[PDB]
């Protein structure tokens, strides 16, 4: 059950301020902790290993079991290693939910996706890690669509993905293909997931 | 003596292959002959001119490796040990080197090369391996 962290110091010492995209601790850019204001140093190969695995895994927030099974399960696909892991670990039902302009928080859109509300493909999708392939109508679950969170997130703007496609009035959605695999260009470098989780 | 002829020729082209000698001798046999036409046709040495005479022998090849240290004979290995024989099926005919070298598997229709033997798609005794 991932929903336990603070959500300030986890990004604050996790390596990069996301997400975001301003909630990175701009008041104190150092790492969080009692011995944290001082000079930071680099790690070993396990330093970039833990920063790559904890950094790229903290963007979604799953447990190490499901994230590991997405590591080898992502490596079971075709293409390249870090690209398949990158399109897999971000094409989830909650990343497709909060990436479609659904909710203004990754945990908030997560609980909006597994709260029974955001039912997609015409039916309900009640598991926050139960994704949808390219072409499923990632809907809004119109029996409770008149809400404050959905209307406010429909009022708040954001750069919608070109792998996906939104709907603010028709109450629908879609994912046109796999997302822009190298195109989705955060700081999460997939080589550290090819090294700090490969042994 | 005479443990294996092809290992004597391969040790000849190896030891002369590091000596920087112009020509190299050999014991003239059907393996030195067909291996001379294969290993000469693939472009390692300049020319084999099998100057035969009584009683047996005797091949005489020239090292076709220029100024640059280590020419087209850059390293050879006994891929087949006369004494514990190698084997290779059709799908398991391994191409030695990966992209640079070439192996010579003695196919059932002649002493082929690696890619040509895979072109026939039939393997045999792994005759030698020139990495």
């Amino acid at each position: 059950a991932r929903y336990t962290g603070p959500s300030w110091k986890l990004s604050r010492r996790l390596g990069i301020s996301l997400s975001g995209t301003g909630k990175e601790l701009e008041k104190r850019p150092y790492a969080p902790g009692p011995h944290g204001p001082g000079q930071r140093k680099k790690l070993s190969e396990y330093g970039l290993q833990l920063q790559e695995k904890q950094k790229l895994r903290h963007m979604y927030g799953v447990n190490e079991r499901q994230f590991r099974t997405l590591f080898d399960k992502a490596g079971k696909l075709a293409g390249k290693h870090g690209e398949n892991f990158m399109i897999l670990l971000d094409s989830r039902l909650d990343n497709v939910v909060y990436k479609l302009g659904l909710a203004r928080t990754r945990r908030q859109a997560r609980q909006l996706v597994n709260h029974g509300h955001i039912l997609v493909d015409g039916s309900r999708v009640d598991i926050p890690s139960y994704l949808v392939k390219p072409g499923q109508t990632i809907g809004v679950r119109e029996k409770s669509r008149n809400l404050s969170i959905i209307k406010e997130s429909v009022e708040v703007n954001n750069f919608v993905p070109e792998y996906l496609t939104f709907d603010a009035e028709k109450l629908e959605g879609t994912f046109t293909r796999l997302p822009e695999r190298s195109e989705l260009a955060p700081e999460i470098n997939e080589a550290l997931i090819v090294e700090f989780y490969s042994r | 003596v005479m443990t294996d002829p092809i290992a004597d020729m391969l040790t000849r082209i190896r030891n002369a292959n590091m000596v920087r000698h112009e020509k190299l001798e050999i014991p003239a046999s059907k393996l030195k002959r067909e291996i001379a036409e294969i290993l000469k046709r693939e472009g390692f040495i300049r020319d084999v001119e099998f100057v035969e005479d009584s009683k047996q022998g005797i091949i005489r090849v020239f090292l076709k490796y220029g100024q640059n240290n280590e020419r087209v004979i850059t390293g050879l290995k006994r891929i087949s040990k006369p004494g514990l024989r190698v084997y290779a099926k059709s799908n398991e005919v391994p191409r030695v080197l990966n992209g640079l070298g070439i192996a010579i598997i003695s196919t059932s229709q002649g002493v082929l090369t690696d890619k040509e033997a895979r072109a026939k798609q039939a393997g045999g005794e792994v005759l030698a391996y020139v990495w």
Binding site: H81, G82, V194, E195 | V72, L97, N98, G99, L100
Partner: protein
């Protein structure tokens, strides 16, 4: 040859900064020794260093060692031409040619050297010695012996791109 000039951006990773002491009259005159290898990020990755009195001094003599030598390492796009077991100095290295997204799976001195010398997918697991200087020595000889396919067709006169796959 040829000795490549210091004409690029060097990486300057430190391999390991070992202690050293000459047992002289009075204890042991301790001097730091660090063999830290600088890398160009395209193929000029050379790894030698020296000794000096302070840790930054060993950084200075090591960087002078990186400005000493450089290697080529010809490899077409996340590989080497022929994955040869390259080790000289009683310490082996078994670096094969890997695929595109198979990562730079190497060890301490291999992961430093190839990790700072432009590697994309070259599987490497050693077999032999484990000194640092022996690792950079046999790894440097193995990287400095692996052949390139275009020049391998251009020096052994059969045909360029006649050996493909």
């Amino acid at each position: 040859r040829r000795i490549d000039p210091s004409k690029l951006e060097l990486e300057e990773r430190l391999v390991t900064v070992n202690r050293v002491a000459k047992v002289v009259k009075g204890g042991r005159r301790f001097r730091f020794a660090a063999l830290v290898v600088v890398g160009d990020k395209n193929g000029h990755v050379g790894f030698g260093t020296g000794k000096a009195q302070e840790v930054p001094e060993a950084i200075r003599k090591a960087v002078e060692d990186a400005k000493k030598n450089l290697i080529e390492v010809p490899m077409v796009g996340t590989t080497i031409p022929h994955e040869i077991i390259g080790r000289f100095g009683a310490g082996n290295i078994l670096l094969k040619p890997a695929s595109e997204g198979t990562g730079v799976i190497a060890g301490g001195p291999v992961r430093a050297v190839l990790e700072l010398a432009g590697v994309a997918d070259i599987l490497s697991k050693s077999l032999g010695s484990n000194t640092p200087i022996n690792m950079i020595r046999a790894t440097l000889q193995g990287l400095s012996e692996l052949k390139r396919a275009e020049d391998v067709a251009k020096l052994r006169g059969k045909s360029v791109e006649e050996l493909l796959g």
